[PDB]
Amino acid sequence: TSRRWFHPNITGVEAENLLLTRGVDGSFLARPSPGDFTLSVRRNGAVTHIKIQNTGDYYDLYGGEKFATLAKLVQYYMEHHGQLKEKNGDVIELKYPLNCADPTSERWFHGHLSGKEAEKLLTEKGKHGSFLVRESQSHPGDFVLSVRTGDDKGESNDGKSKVTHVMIRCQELKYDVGGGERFDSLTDLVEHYKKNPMVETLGTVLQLKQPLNTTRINAAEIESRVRELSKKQGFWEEFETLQQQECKLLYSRKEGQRQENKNKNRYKNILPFDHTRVVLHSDYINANIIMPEKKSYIATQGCLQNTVNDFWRMVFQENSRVIVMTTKEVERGKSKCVKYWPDEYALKEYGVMRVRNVKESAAHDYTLRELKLSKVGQGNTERTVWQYHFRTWPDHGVPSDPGGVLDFLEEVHHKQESIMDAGPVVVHCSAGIGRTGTFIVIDILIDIIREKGVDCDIDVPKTIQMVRSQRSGMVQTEAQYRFIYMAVQHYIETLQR
Ligand SMILES: CC1(N)CCN(c2cnc(-c3cccc(Cl)c3Cl)c(N)n2)CC1
């Protein structure tokens, strides 16, 4: 569970060179291509490149299956759960992950950074255990590990906290700390000294507890940050650093893997976490609760014809009053969601549930439907559910401008507020992770902003990671990540005007 097999800055020829020179039959590595990826596997003394497409909904292993994360794909195939057979029939077997040495995707690596800058950052934002690695300014080629140790966090003036700088020599492509073991990369060195902290001569234990947070920003300055991330790419490096931490979120999904529930998932290997699974009071639905660390969400898949009734049971049980569909019924020739709502003015029964379609309202980017949900046998249980069906989301990538999405979310939020103590807001697309995660993260950040104003801190990676711990693969592509950033920027600018 390390994910050292993903090389962010490698190309096809370099991957072939690595697999043949420093590898053996069974060695594999994943690499990024424009939005797609490649799994290069050594077999029979040669290399085979399998394409992995991710347009925004899921990872598509050509000749394989759909996955919410590259980590889960590699796990699925290494552990023999599935066999990556080729069109010929011969099995392509993953065996030995060829570890990468590039640290640009590590949370704690800040190349362009001086000693005084790093010490100032640690004094300001770091606490006990906060650490970072930087390039040595006095020794070109070597590095420096700056670690803080003390009692409290912040720029204290009592001598209880302090910053220590440990030199890291890079000799013959191997990293050491002036003596002892020589590690194959900065990552191995950092992990070793995380497990086995250094002890100073007088007792001080240099604990590498958490990396120094460099992503939390004040909203007012997002503009600058965006430019700082636009000058490889800033957005790309930050999103890849976020992806690197996906192997720490492979939680249990046994309920979705049950044989009774197989037919209730649109995609086989995209399942809900057990600890945030939506339980029905026939208890299974591919849905998860998303709770920001007041308004909660339900992230779920597009309805299957055999799950519409369970979907409406969920909406009723959870007392949800707002639904957000971010996909049309068919995309690029494939079906992504079954029509689960009645035609305008019509009334339809889904199992024990009943749904009237009172009125519809066609907007530029979306359609609003005022449905009335009730339970057959008791009319007192009639309630109004407002379905906001977004229709102008491109089949590939993300919108070019976030204004439509922002007004959409603003209306959704006002509607959710109009109903007192309303249940979670249901949000779904196809697999319920890509567009769903993007919309939910944007809604969370914009709610923070609207409540606390411009004078507040926002952390996009932290929010996305908190949401990913509740459903696998929330926010799928770097395009959606940059779109989140740009939508926050646009909302800040509109509020400032
Ligand atoms: C310059 C650099 N090499 C790439 C950007 N940078 C960072 C920092 N922190 C995060 C972060 C923040 C909160 C949660 C999670 Cl999970 C993550 Cl990963 C991040 N994604 N990138 C630092 C190193």
Numbering used by the authors: 2 to 34, 38 to 235, 244 to 293, 302 to 313, 324 to 527
How do the authors describe this structure?
The full-length, wild-type SHP2 (FL-WT) contains three domains: a protein tyrosine phosphatase domain (PTP) and two preceding Src homology 2 domains (N-SH2 and C-SH2). In diseases caused by SHP2, mutations are often observed at the N-SH2/PTP interface (e.g., E76D/E76K), resulting in constitutively active protein and abnormal cellular proliferation.
As wild-type SHP2 is presumed to sample the open conformation infrequently, we investigated an NS/leukemia-associated mutant, E76K. The convergence of chemical shifts between WT and mutant proteins indicates that both forms close upon inhibitor binding. Consistent with our findings that FL-WT is primarily closed and FL-E76K primarily open, chemical shift changes upon SHP099 binding are larger for the mutant relative to WT. Second, SHP099 dissociates faster from the mutant protein (koff = 0.10 ± 0.01 s−1). Stopped-flow kinetics of SHP099 with both wild-type and mutant SHP2 found that reduced affinity in FL-E76K arises from an inverted open/closed population, as well as an expedited koff.
